[PDB]
Amino acid sequence: KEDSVEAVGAQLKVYHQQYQDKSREYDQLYEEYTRTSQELQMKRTAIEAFNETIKIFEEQGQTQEKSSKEYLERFRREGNEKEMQRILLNSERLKSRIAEIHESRTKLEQELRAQASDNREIDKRMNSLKPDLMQLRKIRDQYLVWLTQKGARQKKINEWLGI
């Protein structure tokens, strides 16, 4: 019968469109994934630059209080309160400045981690599409083979596929 053949052909058409659609959905995700993945790479790199500056500053604060303890042994005997209250004030200049760049590193890192976490979600969404993609492709291929086996030529197959 030429009716069972057109019915399968129509059903092939349905599965192929579904597969083209899931497949486009999949690749959209893949492209958003690879993109934010580069952005993450640029953030990590900027964080690395934050890290080395912060390093410098930390090993300078520890260098300006490693001598400011021994030089509260010449300035122990005083005790000025317009001059003695002033020599730990540049210790406060240095602390407020490590703190400030810490605040800035931590806001970058907070943004990076949230972004990384968003891309893991995209990866899950893709990974979730696979079983339907696989099933659909296979089933679309079985319809195609059944039509070949019943005498359909490539040109007719191609018309049902819409290609």
Binding site: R137, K138, D141, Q142, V145, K150
Partner: protein, 120 residues
Amino acid sequence: SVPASRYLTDMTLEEMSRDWSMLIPKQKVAGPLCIRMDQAIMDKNIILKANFSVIFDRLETLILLRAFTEEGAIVGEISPLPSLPGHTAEDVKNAVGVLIGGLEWNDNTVRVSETLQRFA
């Protein structure tokens, strides 16, 4: 790690759907499968390519297997019979042996795909 579900496709849609003819038809029903080979092909190198699924690490279902010459021509096929309910992995392994044998009788050198080596 191991999915324990995949659909392996050696062939493009174009290969699966291409029109082909046997100069000297040889055809045999192998359970639920159909095996086809051109009795006129001789002294060629042939590659068996297939589309099929796996579960576990094992072949589950054949969708289609076609035999290609080095020049890309189709000279044999294994396929499910459209009438009928399906087949097992074993029908599949037997149909392949039967086809390789048929092509070797005529002095063809027969290779199978890597996906086939691996699961089938």
